[PDB]
């Protein structure tokens, strides 16, 4: 809590990590300004990596001397020693036991802020000596992972299989993955990625992938590798075209100094720079607006949403913005409990695996990734393969992995900040399978009204009012709050993306078997999480962090969001003192929470249920993929028993690795006027028909901008505008009940403009010919009744 952090400073100074004047530079703690701060933290390495070894010596000193006790953190002075024996019992020698459940489980997030296992990269495990040189080939470090574990975390009683392939279920996969995401900084970075092998078809040599070396899940081998094939079916052709091994082996090497991420190959002989043009101007309309008494010098409505432009090398910088993603090792008991609660949230929906002739592609003429986009849109591949092969493909990627390439394009749309936003269009060979796998659950989430995850619930026809009245599910002293995650798309640690994919794959308890589920998850990881981006004619490597062009994007984001909320809640309930909580129920609740968290190993369904009900009665939410609104009881939140913006700041500080400054967390304290801003639509309370309803209303500057600046030249004439304006007016109607006068006028502007447009249209038409028969219905768009119908609850 940067307002009062007066021991972090004292430690960092006491141990010569950074001299004093550092902290007189404003804005230092931030991880996205002066990322140099990591160099300051990483100078606690060889003071933490010493404490670990002193613990492992002490544990043995206990075991072989016949004592039993617990090892709490707060008995170890930073030097390393141990000095507390108040409650140790003694038994017959050679048989003691140390209990280290709750010691290595609070240090896990620190073991990768302060990068404490990097003195294992040097030779002889000494610091001063020079680096080690692993052979370039060695593609399998199982033995080394085993030795590191057995030398640092010795008495951690559970098991740990390096290659996650042989893990028992969704409570062991998370465990072993979160261990690997720490053990995988000591190994060179040019030994992950696909694994290739020279196979033979029709007596000609190839090189095609057969495996993978994930940085978390370990080594994974295909199960159907066919040496000496003779024919090439269409499924086979697809699988071998989407693969990146052929391309990265037939290209030529490349070293890029524009970024700091990796760089694999460069397909062409030239790099291609990409630009973004400005957008055209709708003069006629702007001159109208200025004539109606607008845009004056010193008003309250002004343009702020323009079409920004970009020079050549924007794309590579915007890809380089990945430098924020760090390998973070989340705690591993609080996570294995929070995942339980977060699953309870997703109870009611259903789903499973489906056939091929049931998937419903919404829109079909959109690009199909690389390199398939050189021969057709998606319609071609979706009409070429028959349901038979289109299902054999699925039931074949249930038993192997398929790397892919995903492109990266600059977007062309209105905005208010001069940064350019990119979007990743994944290759079809992945969307087909992901669609078939998730479609049932997703179409079951988007068609259920009255639950937490609110996707697919319109704001029209009295939808916003129903959302807002569901959220107040009878909490006691409401105070609606909010928050927002900075750089949510480029900092989400890999562990939380994996937890999201697991919780969304927790429905096929009966459609699919266990190895099937694991190969599906490995496939999704290697296709979306850590893929081979192709940014401007040259491959690269994504370090991590989600991508925004796959199938399961908004829902995965919603899951991660609920996970951060529940984690902050758990932290805020534990951290409270405990002896001052006056009530006799919540204190017992805490006292059972801690024990069920650390002093236990198997699920506790009854207690999980009690906690989740407690939440749903004091922390009602509403979530649309990262845009939250909470309605937390307030007397509690002040006594310390639910979340608070300070707690969200903390949780993002040690799990996302960014800093959420409190200048963007609006907190409304009056229940009537609704949430300050949700999904970019402020909310007002307007009388309508003898009862009061909520209405959503946009930000006027955005509507004016969307009318005045159009992206294509043909959209500047009032040929189609007679229709492109009905929609803008429909979105801008609620401004007609605002009290501010310019908010009252940005409606009648559009409404007079439509009429003038239609009159000049009939003029030109009755000139080009001399007749017109039944274009009368348009007399119903320029009256304020048709729209006033659009925010009523009948239909």
């Amino acid at each position: 809590d940067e307002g009062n952090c007066d021991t972090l400073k004292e430690i960092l100074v006491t141990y010569n990590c950074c001299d004093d004047d550092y902290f007189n530079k404003k804005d230092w703690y931030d991880f996205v300004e002066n990322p140099d701060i990591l160099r300051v933290y990483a100078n606690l390495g060889e003071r933490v990596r010493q404490a670990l070894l002193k613990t492992v010596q002490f544990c043995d000193a206990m075991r072989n001397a016949g004592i039993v006790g617990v090892l709490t953190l707060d008995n170890q002075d930073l030097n390393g020693n141990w000095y507390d024996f108040g409650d140790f019992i003694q038994t017959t020698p050679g048989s003691g036991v140390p209990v280290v459940d709750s010691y290595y489980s609070l240090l896990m997030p620190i073991l990768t802020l302060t990068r404490a296992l990097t003195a294992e990269s040097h030779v002889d495990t000494d610091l001063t000596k020079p680096y080690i040189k692993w052979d370039l080939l060695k593609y399998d470090f199982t033995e080394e992972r085993l030795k590191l574990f057995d030398r640092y975390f010795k008495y951690w009683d559970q098991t740990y299989h390096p290659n996650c392939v042989n893990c028992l279920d969704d409570r062991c996969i998370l465990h072993c993955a979160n261990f690997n995401v720490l053990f995988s900084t000591v190994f060179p970075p040019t030994s992950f990625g696909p694994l290739v092998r020279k196979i033979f078809v029709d007596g000609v040599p190839f090189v095609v992938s057969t495996g993978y070396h994930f940085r978390e899940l370990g080594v994974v081998h295909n199960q159907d590798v066919n040496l000496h094939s003779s024919r090439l079916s269409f499924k086979e052709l697809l699988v071998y075209a989407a693969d990146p091994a052929m391309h990265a082996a037939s290209g030529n090497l490349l070293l890029d100094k524009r970024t700091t991420c990796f760089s694999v190959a460069a397909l062409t002989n030239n790099v291609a720079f990409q630009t973004v043009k400005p957008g055209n101007f709708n003069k006629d309309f702007y001159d109208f607006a200025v004539s109606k008494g607008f845009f004056k010098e010193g008003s309250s409505v002004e343009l702020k949403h323009f079409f920004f432009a970009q020079d050549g090398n924007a794309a590579i910088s915007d890809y380089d913005y990945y430098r924020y993603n760090l390998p973070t090792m989340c705690d591993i008991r609080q996570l294995l409990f929070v995942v339980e609660v977060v699953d309870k949230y997703f109870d009611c929906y259903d789903g499973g695996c489906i056939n091929a002739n049931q998937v419903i592609v919404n829109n079909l003429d959109k690009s199909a990734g690389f390199p398939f986009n050189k021969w057709g849109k998606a319609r071609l591949y979706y009409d070429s393969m028959s349901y038979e092969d289109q299902d054999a493909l699925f039931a074949y990627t249930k038993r192997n992995v398929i790397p892919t390439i995903t492109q990266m394009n600059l977007k062309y749309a209105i905005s208010a900040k001069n940064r350019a936003r990119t979007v990743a269009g994944v290759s079809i060979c992945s969307t087909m399978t992901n669609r078939q796998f998730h479609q049932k659950l997703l179409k079951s989430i988007a068609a259920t009204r009255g639950a937490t995850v609110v996707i697919g619930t319109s704001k029209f026809y009295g939808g916003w009012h129903n959302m807002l009245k569901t959220v107040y599910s009878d909490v006691e002293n409401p105070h609606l709050m909010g928050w927002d995650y900075p750089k949510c798309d480029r900092a989400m640690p890999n562990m939380l993306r994996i937890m999201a994919s697991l919780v969304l794959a927790r429905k096929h308890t009966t459609c699919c078997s266990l190895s099937h589920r694991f190969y599906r998850l490995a496939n999704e990881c290697a296709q979306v999480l850590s893929e081979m981006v192709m940014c401007g004619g040259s491959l690269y490597v994504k370090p991590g962090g989600t991508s925004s062009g796959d199938a399961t994007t908004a829902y995965a984001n919603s899951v991660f969001n609920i996970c951060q909320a529940v984690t902050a809640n758990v932290n805020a309930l534990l951290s409270t003192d405990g002896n001052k909580i006056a009530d006799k129920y919540v204190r017992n609740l805490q006292h059972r929470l801690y024990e069920c968290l650390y002093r236990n190993r198997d699920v506790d369904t009854d207690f999980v249920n009690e906690f989740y009900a407690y939440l749903r009665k004091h922390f009602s939410m509403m979530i649309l993929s990262d845009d939250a609104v909470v309605c937390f009881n307030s007397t509690y939140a002040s006594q310390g028993l639910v979340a608070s913006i300070k707690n969200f700041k903390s949780v993002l500080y040690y799990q996302n690795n960014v800093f959420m400054s409190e200048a963007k967390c609006w907190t409304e304290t009056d229940l009537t006027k609704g949430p300050h801003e949700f999904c970019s639509q402020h909310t007002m309370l307007v009388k309508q028909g003898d009862d009061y309803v909520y209405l959503p209303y946009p930000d006027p500057s955005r509507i004016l901008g969307a009318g005045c600046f159009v992206d294509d030249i043909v959209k500047t004439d009032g040929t189609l505008m007679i229709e492109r304006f009905v929609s803008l007016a429909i979105d801008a109607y609620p401004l007609t009940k605002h009290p501010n006068q310019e908010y009252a006028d940005v409606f009648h502007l559009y409404l007079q403009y439509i009429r003038k447009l239609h009159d000049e249209l009939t003029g030109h038409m009755l000139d080009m010919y001399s007749v017109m028969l039944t274009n009368d219905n348009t007399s119903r768009y320029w009256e304020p009744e048709f729209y006033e119908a659009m925010y009523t609850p009948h239909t």
């Binding site: 696909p194 290739v196 020279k198 057969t210 990146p244 037939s250 050549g312 021969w375």
Partner: protein, 142 residues
């Protein structure tokens, strides 16, 4: 009335069938063409890779499995450095030969961002502003 309705049905039925046949033919044509395109690209890509050194290192590998990145990193014959500034220039690929990834390369052409050529003399600390950075400099294994 009977026969008139029968013929009226027959028209729509035949036309549906005919447009359906057209759709089928169209799909088959596109399918065959795309398969030919895919096969052609695959074979022309394959017939390029430097088969000798690749055979060498793979047959050296103890299983036939080698992580992908080292495949170009040790069998590519080219190197497309990209430089954003005179400083990193000075510190990566100065002069006419340089060393990277444990092997010896030599420059052969230094094309700037406008796809022009730039003689190795022009790149000088006082001749920085006139050159539209970055500086895509190729090379060759040696």
């Amino acid at each position: 009335d009977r026969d008139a309705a029968m013929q009226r049905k027959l028209e729509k039925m035949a036309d549906q069938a005919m447009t359906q046949m057209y759709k089928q033919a169209r799909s088959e044509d596109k399918r065959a063409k795309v398969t030919s395109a895919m096969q052609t690209m695959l074979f022309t890509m394959l017939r390029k890779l430097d088969n000798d050194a690749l055979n060498n290192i793979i047959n050296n590998a103890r299983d036939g499995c080698v992580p992908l990145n080292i495949i170009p990193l040790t069998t590519a014959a080219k190197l497309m450095v990209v430089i954003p500034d005179y400083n990193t220039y000075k510190n990566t690929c100065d002069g006419t030969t340089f060393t990277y990834a444990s092997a010896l390369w030599e420059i052969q052409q230094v094309v700037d961002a406008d796809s022009k050529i730039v003689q190795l003399s022009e790149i000088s600390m006082d001749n920085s502003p006139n050159l539209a950075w970055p500086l895509i400099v190729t090379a060759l294994r040696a």
